[PDB]
Write a protein that binds this ligand. Structure first.
Ligand code: HEC
Ligand code: HEC
Ligand code: HEC
Ligand code: HEC
Length: 118
C-alpha cells in the first residue's frame, strides 16, 4: 500500500474509556500527529507487523481481532497487549527512548510532546 501523508493524526478508537479522576469523569489525551516520512528508515512491516498475514493490506491497529479493547489501562490489566495504551506506547516510545540513549535523531518521549493536537 502507500503510506498516508504527514498530516495524518492517530486518535483513540470511538468508545475508548479513560481512567476516572477519582470521582470526577476522566478525559482522553490529546491526539497524536504521526508523520510517515520521518519513519522511512523503518520497514513498513516492523510497525505493521501483521502485514503478511493480512495479505499486504494495512489494517488499523485497533481493528476487530487486533488491539480492539476499549478498556483503560489499570493495574489488573496492565499486561494486556489488547489495550490501546500498551499497543501504541510499546511501539512508539520504546524506539524513541532507545535512539535517544544512543545519541542520534529521534522522536518524542514526553507525554505532552507526542499528545499535541488541541
Ligand atoms: C508518542 C511518542 C507517545 C508518547 C511519548 C506517549 N503516548 Fe500516549 N499514546 C500514543 C498514541 C499514538 C496513542 C494512541 C492514540 C490515542 O491518542 O489514543 C496513545 C494513547 C494514550 C492513552 C490511551 C488513550 C487516552 O486515554 O487518551 C493514554 C492514557 C496515553 N497515551 C497517555 C500517555 C502518557 C501519560 C504519556 C507519558 C507517560 C504518553 N501517553 C506518552 C503515543 C504517545
Ligand atoms: C511505525 C514507525 C510505522 C512505520 C515505519 C510505518 N507506519 Fe504506517 N502507520 C503507523 C501507525 C501507528 C498508523 C496508525 C494506525 C492506527 O491504527 O491508527 C499508521 C497508518 C498507516 C496507514 C493508514 C491506516 C488507516 O488510517 O486506515 C497506512 C495505509 C500505512 N500506515 C501505511 C504504511 C506503509 C506502506 C509503510 C511503509 C512505507 C508504513 N505504513 C510504515 C505506523 C507506521
Ligand atoms: C490484528 C490483525 C493486528 C494488527 C492489525 C496489529 N496487531 Fe499488534 N498484535 C496483534 C497480536 C495478535 C499480537 C500478539 C499476540 C498476543 O496476544 O500478545 C500483537 C502484538 C503486538 C505487540 C507486541 C510485540 C512484541 O511483544 O513483540 C505490539 C507492541 C503491537 N502488536 C502493536 C501494534 C500496533 C501499534 C499496530 C498498528 C500499527 C499493530 N500492533 C497492529 C494483532 C494485531
Ligand atoms: C523506531 C523503530 C521508531 C518507531 C517505532 C517510531 N518512531 Fe517516531 N521517530 C523515529 C525516528 C528515528 C525519528 C527521527 C527521524 C528523523 O529523521 O529525524 C522519529 C521521529 C518522530 C516524530 C518527529 C519528532 C521531531 O523531533 O520532530 C514524531 C512526531 C514521531 N516520531 C512519532 C512517532 C509515533 C506516534 C510512533 C508510534 C506509532 C513512532 N514515532 C514510532 C523512530 C521511531
Amino acid at each position: 500500500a502507500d503510506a498516508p501523508g504527514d498530516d495524518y493524526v492517530i486518535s483513540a478508537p470511538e468508545g475508548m474509556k479513560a481512567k476516572p479522576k477519582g470521582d470526577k469523569p476522566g478525559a482522553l489525551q490529546k491526539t497524536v500527529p504521526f508523520p510517515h516520512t520521518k519513519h522511512a528508515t523503518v520497514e513498513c512491516v516492523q510497525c505493521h507487523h501483521t502485514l503478511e498475514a493480512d495479505g499486504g493490506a494495512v489494517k488499523k491497529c485497533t481493528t476487530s481481532g487486533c488491539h480492539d479493547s476499549l478498556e483503560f489501562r489499570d493495574k489488573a490489566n496492565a499486561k494486556d497487549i489488547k489495550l490501546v495504551e500498551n499497543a501504541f506506547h510499546t511501539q512508539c516510545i520504546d524506539c524513541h527512548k532507545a535512539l535517544k540513549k544512543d545519541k542520534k535523531p529521534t522522536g518524542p518521549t514526553a507525554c505532552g510532546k507526542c499528545h499535541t493536537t488541541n
